[PDB]
Write a protein that binds this ligand. Structure first.
Ligand SMILES: N=C(N)NCCCCN
Length: 355
């Protein structure tokens, strides 16, 4: 009656859970989908209770044989907490992962360099203060790689009935069904929501080709777990994401490609921000900024540039009737990054929500 956490680095995890739940023991609660630093990113972890940890390792390996895997006890699980934090909000080297695995004799399956190990350990050690659920439907093997068939309208009807119990599944303004991937992966669709109830209802209203397997995951998606407040650092750096307050010093200007840039003066000096082309209408908002506007930006730092996920216009330049209204703005659903918390999940005022 041993309780162990499996860390893998989602389809394969589901196949693995299956064999566990049928040949070695049960699975406690909901499996977990953890995303790592978005600038460097998924990894799955699940709690199980078997008798022979060695047996459990034997299974998973066969499954992986038809990649990093870790098997830690609920005990060590709490220790990996910091490793998980650094893997999500900072940068880790595969050395640091090999160290932990070595220090606590964590049984594992290593392949080559073993960069799958960082995710495997991170998935197990991640402590979720906030979280969201995701229902992932899979296709039958026979259809992997072919074109997904589904009724676009059914997803829009579904969001119309469930939103916000389910969210960021479709994009009305840009007319896109964002919960459906366009890759050779086994995933048919991935609906995000606030509960099993809503997700189950969603799965029942949506129309698509026959769904083979399905799994509701607990994830750090849409939580803002990657953001570092500016009161926590002395200097900013690339490959990290922040929530910075600043004052516009250089007004918006477009560049080749449909992107809009500008700069803000901050406790750290001037910082350049951007609203790349995929953000669509969100650029309309950005183009209205003016020298003097005080704001608070949220985003990943890359090449010394904040890649806007959302922004808050705190104060409009003192000396102006402008179109810009104070309050929150965010990229449309189709430009949403996995870890970005959507305004519909934030109990704040002045939220301008684009559905
Ligand atoms: N609804 C989802 N499962 N994902 C939404 C992703 C939006 C950015 N591509």
């Amino acid at each position: 009656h041993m309780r162990v956490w499996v860390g893998i680095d989602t389809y394969l995890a589901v196949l693995a859970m299956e064999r566990v739940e049928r040949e070695l023991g049960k699975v406690i609660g909901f499996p977990r989908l953890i995303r790592l630093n978005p600038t460097i990113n998924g990894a799955v972890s699940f709690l199980v209770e078997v008798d022979d940890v060695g047996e459990l390792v034997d299974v998973v390996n066969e499954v992986i044989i038809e990649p990093g895997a870790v098997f830690v006890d609920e005990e060590l699980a709490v220790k990996l907490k910091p490793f998980a934090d650094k893997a999500i909000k900072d940068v880790l080297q595969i050395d640091e992962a090999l160290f932990v695995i070595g220090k606590y004799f964590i049984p594992h399956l290593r392949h080559k360099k073993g960069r799958g190990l960082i995710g495997a350990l991170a998935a197990v050690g991640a402590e979720l203060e906030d979280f969201t659920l995701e229902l992932i439907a899979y296709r039958y093997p026979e259809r992997f790689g072919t074109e997904r068939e589904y009724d676009e309208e059914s997803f829009f009807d579904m969001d119309y009935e469930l939103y916000p119990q389910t969210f960021d599944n479709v994009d009305w303004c840009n007319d896109v069904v964002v919960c459906i991937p366009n890759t050779p992966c086994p995933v048919l669709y991935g609906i995000r929501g606030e509960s099993v109830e809503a997700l189950y209802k969603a799965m029942e209203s949506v129309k698509t080709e026959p769904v083979d397997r399905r799994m509701i995951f607990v994830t750090n998606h849409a939580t803002d777990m990657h953001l570092i407040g500016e009161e926590e650092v002395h200097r900013l750096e690339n490959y990290r994401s922040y929530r910075l307050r600043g004052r516009v010093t250089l007004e918006p200007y477009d560049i080749e490609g449909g992107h809009v840039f500008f700069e803000i003066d901050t406790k750290f000096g001037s910082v350049k921000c951007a609203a790349f082309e995929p953000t669509k209408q969100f650029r309309n908002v950005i183009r209205l900024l003016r020298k003097g506007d005080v704001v608070e930006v949220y985003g990943s730092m890359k090449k010394d540039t904040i890649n806007l996920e959302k922004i808050q216009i705190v104060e409009l330049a003192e000396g102006s009737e402008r179109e810009l209204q104070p309050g929150f703005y965010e990229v449309p659903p189709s430009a949403r990054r996995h870890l970005s918390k959507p305004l519909i999940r934030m109990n704040v005022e002045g939220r301008h929500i684009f559905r």
